[PDB]
């Protein structure tokens, strides 16, 4: 179960991670219960973000499990993310400090730039003008990264990384004059329909971990995900693999990522499925079965985040 990977800064990340995001209609209380369940089941990597509006609950869950002696703080790998309304250098540490206040934790294990397109500062996560048009902002992401680096210097984040960055954007950070810390990871959509071979190879080449999200084919929340997209977990090949191994399509999709050198997230707010997901460590796939899963690639991106298209930093126009 507890398998970790060494990050490029010498910290360790558990290779299986609990996703904590739920669609807006899901009550906040559910994040609290699910996160406790997840830790009880064996999850030690917990993925959240300021965007998710659940850091009070996830923090409560984590601290409850530390209070009752189930885990120590050093046993939990907790990730947060800097939202698009706090890309300005001077807003970076206040954002992290606000997440920490909400969590009642003294540090996060990992802090990520959530998405490379900036939006106007303020309380609104998606600011719009009086006609409903998104209020984008102009911010040098290299200046953002420098402020994120200072959060590591401060001890407020053990490790730092990025999310939804393309190759060009990784290169921008990596090649920045006076770089202190490379991103330890790039957290991106990744699953058998969209298996990110080119980006995976690039991240590998730069000692950057690829962390897969929507690894089970995504929450499929409208208007974010096209309801007409094929359903990952209904895939005939994943189902046949599941039957052969006495596992589930979900477990096949998870194991796939582990065996290709990808750290993998899995969201569930269902006690049974939470408990089931940690079984990814209990079985293996052959090289032939891995090749079969490689053939499933369809160029299906579930989360285009195309409401943020237009600005130059929109990451998904490039090939990868
Ligand atoms: N950085 C970013 O921009 C970004 C974007 C998307 C996601 N993420 C992160 O990655 C996480 C996971 O991605 P996701 O939220 O799109 O969901 P996901 O992990 O791909 O899972 C999608 C759905 O699968 C169901 N599920 C879970 N285990 C299952 C199983 N064994 N069998 C059948 N169904 C199962 C869940 O429903 P139940 O809850 O009903 O089990 C969940 O709604 C997020 O929660 C978040 O932490 C980050
Ligand atoms: O989970 C996320 O990070 C996420 C981010 C964005 Cl911007 C939108 C949706 Cl629907 C998400 O699920
Ligand atoms: Zn007006």
From Swiss-Prot:
Q: Which GO terms describe its cellular component?
A: cytosol; extracellular exosome
* Outcome of mutating residue 219 to S: Marked decrease in k(cat)/K(m) value for progesterone; 10-fold decrease for progesterone reduction; 3-fold decrease for 20alpha-OHProg oxidation. 10-fold decrease in K(m) value for NADPH
The protein's matches in CDD domains, at most eight in alphabetical order, are given as: AKR_AKR1C1-35
Marked site (Important for substrate specificity) residue numbers: 51
Q: So which tissues is this one expressed in?
A: Expressed in all tissues tested including liver, prostate, testis, adrenal gland, brain, uterus, mammary gland and keratinocytes. Highest levels found in liver, mammary gland and brain.
* Pathway terms, separated by semicolons: Steroid metabolism
Q: Which residues bind substrate?
A: 21, 114, 219, 224
Q: What is its EC number?
A: 1.1.1.-, 1.1.1.112, 1.1.1.209, 1.1.1.210
User: Which protein are we looking at?
Assistant: Aldo-keto reductase family 1 member C1
InterPro entries per the record?
A: AKR, AKR1C, Aldo/ket_reductase_CS, NADP_OxRdtase_dom, NADP_OxRdtase_dom_sf
Q: What task does this protein carry out?
A: Cytosolic aldo-keto reductase that catalyzes the NADH and NADPH-dependent reduction of ketosteroids to hydroxysteroids. Most probably acts as a reductase in vivo since the oxidase activity measured in vitro is inhibited by physiological concentrations of NADPH. Displays a broad positional specificity acting on positions 3, 17 and 20 of steroids and regulates the metabolism of hormones like estrogens and androgens. May also reduce conjugated steroids such as 5alpha-dihydrotestosterone sulfate. Displays affinity for bile acids.
List the residues marked with site May be involved in the mediating step between the transformation of progesterone and the release of the cofactor.
219
Which Pfam families does the record associate with it? Aldo_ket_red
What keywords does the record list, in alphabetical order?
Answer: Cytoplasm, Lipid metabolism, NADP, Oxidoreductase
Q: What processes in GO biological process is this protein linked to?
A: bile acid and bile salt transport; bile acid metabolic process; cellular response to jasmonic acid stimulus; cholesterol homeostasis; daunorubicin metabolic process; digestion; doxorubicin metabolic process; epithelial cell differentiation
PROSITE patterns (UniProt xref): ALDOKETO_REDUCTASE_1 (PS00798), ALDOKETO_REDUCTASE_2 (PS00062), ALDOKETO_REDUCTASE_3 (PS00063)
Quick one: where is this thing mainly located?
cytoplasm
The UniProt similarity line reads:
Belongs to the aldo/keto reductase family.
Q: Where's the active site on this chain?
A: 52
């Amino acid at each position: 179960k507890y398998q970790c990977v060494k990050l490029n800064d010498g910290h360790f990340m558990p290779v299986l991670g609990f996703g904590t995001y739920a669609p807006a209609e899901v009550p906040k209380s559910k994040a609290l219960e699910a996160t406790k369940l997840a830790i009880e089941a064996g999850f030690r990597h917990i993925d959240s973000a300021h965007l998710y509006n659940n850091e009070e609950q996830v923090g409560l869950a984590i601290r409850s499990k530390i209070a009752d002696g189930s885990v120590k703080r050093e046993d939990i790998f907790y990730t947060s993310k800097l939202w698009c309304n706090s890309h300005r250098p001077e807003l970076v540490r206040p954002a992290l400090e606000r997440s920490l206040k909400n969590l009642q934790l003294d540090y996060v294990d990992l802090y990520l730039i959530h998405f490379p397109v900036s939006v106007k500062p303020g309380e609104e996560v998606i600011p719009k003008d009086e006609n409903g048009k998104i209020l984008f902002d102009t911010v040098d992401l290299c200046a953002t990264w420098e402020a994120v680096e200072k959060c590591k210097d401060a001890g407020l984040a053990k490790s730092i990384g990025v999310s939804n960055f393309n190759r060009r954007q990784l290169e921008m950070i990596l090649n920045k004059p006076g770089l202190k810390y490379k991103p330890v990871c790039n957290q991106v959509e990744c699953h058998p329909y969209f298996n990110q071979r080119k980006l995976l190879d690039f991240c590998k080449s730069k000692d950057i971990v690829l962390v897969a999200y929507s690894a089970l084919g995504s929450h499929r929340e409208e208007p974010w995900v096209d309801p007409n997209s094929p359903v990952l977990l209904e895939d005939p090949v994943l189902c046949a693999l599941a039957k052969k191994h006495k596992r589930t399509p979900a477990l096949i999709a998870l194991r796939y990522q582990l065996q290709r050198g990808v750290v993998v997230l899995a969201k569930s707010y269902n006690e049974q499925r939470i408990r089931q997901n940690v079984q990814v460590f209990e079985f293996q796939l052959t090289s032939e079965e891995m090749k079969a899963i490689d053939g499933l690639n369809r160029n299906v991106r579930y989360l285009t985040l195309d409401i943020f298209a237009g600005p130059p930093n929109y990451p998904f126009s490039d090939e990868y």
